[PDB]
Structure formats: C-alpha cells, structure tokens
Amino acid sequence: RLGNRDMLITQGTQLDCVLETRLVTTQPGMTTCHLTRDVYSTSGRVVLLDRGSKVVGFYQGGLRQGQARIFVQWSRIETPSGVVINLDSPGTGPLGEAG
Amino acid sequence: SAAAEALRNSINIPPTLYKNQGERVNILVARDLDFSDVYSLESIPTK
C-alpha cells in the first residue's frame, strides 16, 4: 500500500516541460527544460511541483546508423520555492515515445 | 608496382613549419602567479 497519497508521486506520472536549449547531439552535453503546468500528487489534492520549475538533465553517446531519437535522462528538478528532488527518468517526445 | 612501392614508402613525411622572426606571439598564463614574496609597495612622500 502507499504511504501518503497527498505527498507522493508514483511511477509513470507525466510531467510536461518545454525544452530550453537547442539540442545538438554532436557532443555529449547537458539540457534544460522548465515545467509548464502544475503537477499534482497521485491523490490529486496538492500541487507538488510549482509550474515553471526548472529541470536539468543530460545525454551521451550520440546516435547510431538509422536511429532517429537520442536518449536523455533528467537529473535534478528545482521548484522556485526551494524544493529539490532527484528524479531520474527518461526524456520523451511530446507523446512520450522514448528519447 | 614500382610506383606503389615508392609512394607507400615516402608518403608519410611530417610537414615542416617555418615561422618568421619578430612575429607577435601571446602567452596565456595557465596558473596563478604570486609575487607577495618578492615585491612591496611604499608610498612616495608628497613634496
């Protein structure tokens, strides 16, 4: 069973953020996006990540022949009120396809 | 062939670089340089 649904974000919650930096895979680098909407607890009663929070992540390895998507992971998020948590998740496209 | 043998042997020669004297060159100091132990400032008395 879950501990407290009012302060808990389960796996598979969908965070919608807008990419800040233009992405070029020629070198292993670092990314940045800002959340665009408030993100609630799975109970849907508390705003846990204030909209506009900053998200930092990275990638590596470049592509391989024929591959059409690069795989980025997001390291650390920041709520403008000072909250920092280490979420480690795979970056996706607008509809959530890998990479 | 003979051409292939000659070329395969004498193809890898490093290019030689020539530099004229009196050109401007610049140094980018890569490490902090301290002088506290060799220099000191004293005020020049007025008049």
């Binding site: 292993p28 590596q60 390895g61 | 890569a30 490490r31 301290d34 002088f35 220099y39």
Partner: peptide
C-alpha cells in the same frame, strides 16, 4: 698505548576538472 554514483561515464568524465598548481616568484 691507546684508550679504547558515477553514471554518464562519458560526460561525467569529460567534466573532469584540471587544476594546475600556482607558482611563486623568486
């Protein structure tokens, strides 16, 4: 006569800091 975590092995390696020791004049 006599007396007697480290993941991102590519990136997190390319960000390896390179510190150079300072010097002092003589």
């Amino acid at each position: 006569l006599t007396a007697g975590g480290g993941g991102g092995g590519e990136l997190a390696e390319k960000l390896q800091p390179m510190r150079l020791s300072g010097s002092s004049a003589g």
